[PDB]
Each structure stands twice: as structure tokens, then as C-alpha cells.
Amino acid sequence: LIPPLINLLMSIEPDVIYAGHDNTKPDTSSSLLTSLNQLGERQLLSVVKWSKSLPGFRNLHIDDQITLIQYSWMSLMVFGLGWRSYKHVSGQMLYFAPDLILNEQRMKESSFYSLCLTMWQIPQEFVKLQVSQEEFLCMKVLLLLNTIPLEGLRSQTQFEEMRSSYIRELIKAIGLRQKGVVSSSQRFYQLTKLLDNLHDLVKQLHLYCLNTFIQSRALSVEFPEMMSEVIAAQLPKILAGMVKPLLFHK
Numbered sequence: 001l002i003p004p005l006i007n008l009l010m011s012i013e014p015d016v017i018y019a020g021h022d023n024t025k026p027d028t029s030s031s032l033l034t035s036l037n038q039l040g041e042r043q044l045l046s047v048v049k050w051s052k053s054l055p056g057f058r059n060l061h062i063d064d065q066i067t068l069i070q071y072s073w074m075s076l077m078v079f080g081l082g083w084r085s086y087k088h089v090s091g092q093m094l095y096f097a098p099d100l101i102l103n104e105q106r107m108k109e110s111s112f113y114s115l116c117l118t119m120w121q122i123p124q125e126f127v128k129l130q131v132s133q134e135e136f137l138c139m140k141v142l143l144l145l146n147t148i149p150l151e152g153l154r155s156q157t158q159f160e161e162m163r164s165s166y167i168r169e170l171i172k173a174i175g176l177r178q179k180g181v182v183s184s185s186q187r188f189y190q191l192t193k194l195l196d197n198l199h200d201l202v203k204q205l206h207l208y209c210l211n212t213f214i215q216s217r218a219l220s221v222e223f224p225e226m227m228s229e230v231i232a233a234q235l236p237k238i239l240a241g242m243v244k245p246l247l248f249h250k
């Protein structure tokens with residue numbers, strides 16, 4: 001049977017979130033980017049709500065909670081994007097939302113095709129590894145807990161304990177299907193290596209995002225309130241490498 005913490009994690013998953021995109025008009029660079037920003041805002045609010053229900057998180061200092069959300073939102077959103085694409089469209093479209101689905105042809109006409117291909121890697125890897133929902137749910141918590149300040153957190157002890165607890169839960173999630181010590185240990189390496197590899201992909205997304213933000217007036221792209229502050233609050237520092245990415249492997 002499924003371990004209770006994994007069961008809890010499934011129960012607190014956000015519901016389906018819509019972009020509010022107007023699909024009756026043809027795509028433009030500005031319209032797509034704006035819908036993506038609107039969806040991002042909605043997904044951020046959803047991440048905040050999720051975090052409030054996430055066992056352990058509310059007991060970290062409030063400053064730490066804010067920092068970890070500010071550090072991890074891009075990772076959580078692209079990982080989510082990968083999951084939805086894998087589950088709803090067999091990994092073969094980018095499933096941003098039910099009203100914002102980009103098949104490859106739409107990607108090619110997006111104006112940011114290379115960015116789409118970079119993002120599209122994640123669901124193709126989920127297809128390759130056949131990631132289970134239980135593994136996904138645990139890995140997603142670890143992404144929230146995958147970067148800390150250079151000086152550490154205020155609730156560092158509690159953070160280490162919480163992070164270690166979700167790593168132990170990932171190991172149980174793996175043990176649900178992959179039986180055999182060799183397979184299970186290899187599976188842990190592969191899934192944790194995937195999380196390590198996400199740091200680099202996410203850096204490309206952070207740069208694109210920051211450039212788009214700076215040039216938002218010229219490009220006629222709107223950035224909502226919570227998006228503007230999470231970017232204001234940490235993106236340059238993160239891009240500069242003035243934080244500590246946590247790696248599972250050297």
C-alpha cells in the first residue's frame with residue numbers, strides 16, 4: 001500500500017489551473033507570453049497554498065518559507081508542466097494548462113521555439129523513466145527544498161530534518177514498484193540525478209524570464225504582482241550563483 005505521507009501529498013495537490021487564454025484569436029509573441037505570465041501568477045498562488053498544507057513547511061521560520069518559494073518556483077512550475085504533459089498528452093505536447101496546450105507546430109510558431117524544446121525535455125525524460133505519481137510527489141517537495149542561501153536558513157536544523165524526511169519518502173516511493181536492491185539504488189541515483197540536472201535547465205529559464213521582465217514594456221508583455229516581486233526579490237542573485245544549490249551528487 002501507499003505510505004501515509006505520499007497519500008497526504010496526493011491529497012494536497014492543487015486542482016487544475018487555467019491560463020485564461022483566448023483561443024479564438026491567433027497566437028502572437030505578446031499574447032502567449034502574457035497568458036504564460038497570468039498562468040504563472042495563478043500557479044504561484046497555488047504553490048503558496050500547497051506549501052501551507054505541506055507537512056513540515058509551516059514550522060520553518062516565515063522568512064525561510066518565503067526564501068524557499070522565491071528560490072524554487074521556476075523549478076516547481078517546469079516540473080509540474082512536465083508532469084501534466086506526460087500524464088495528459090503522452091509527453092508529446094506542452095500542457096501548460098487545459099486552455100494553453102502547445103503541440104510542436106504551435107511551439108515552432110511561438111517565437112520561442114528553442115525555449116519550448118528546452119522545457120519539452122522534462123516530459124520526454126518522464127516518458128523515458130516512467131516516473132510514478134508517488135515518485136513525482138516526493139521529487140516535487142525536494143525541488144522546493146533544493147536551494148538555500150549561502151548563509152543557510154534561519155531554521156536550518158528543521159530544514160535539514162524536513163529535507164531528509166522527504167528523501168527517505170522518495171526512497172519508499174521507489175520501493176513501491178522497483179523491487180530489488182540494485183534496481184532501487186540505481187533508481188534513486190537516476191531520479192536524484194534528474195533533480196540535479198534541473199538546476200541547469202532552470203538557469204536558462206531564469207535568464208529568459210529576467211530578460212523578458214526587463215524588456216516587458218517594449219515587448220508588450222504584462223507581468224502580474226506576485227511574479228514581479230518574486231523576480232525582483234531574487235532572480236539576479238540566483239542567476240549570479242549567490243545561493244547554494246543542493247546537489248545529491250558530485
Ligand SMILES: CC#C[C@]1(O)CC[C@H]2[C@@H]3CCC4=CC(=O)CCC4=C3[C@@H](c3ccc(N(C)C)cc3)C[C@@]21C
Pocket residue numbers: 033036037038039040041043044073074077078080081096097112115205206208209210212224226227228230
Ligand atoms: C515563453 C516564456 C517564458 C518565461 O519567461 C521563461 C520560463 C517560463 C515559465 C516556464 C514554466 C511555466 C510553467 C507553467 O505551467 C506556467 C508558466 C511558466 C512559465 C512562465 C511564468 C510566468 C510568470 C511567473 N510568475 C508570475 C512567478 C511564473 C512563470 C513564463 C516563463 C517564466
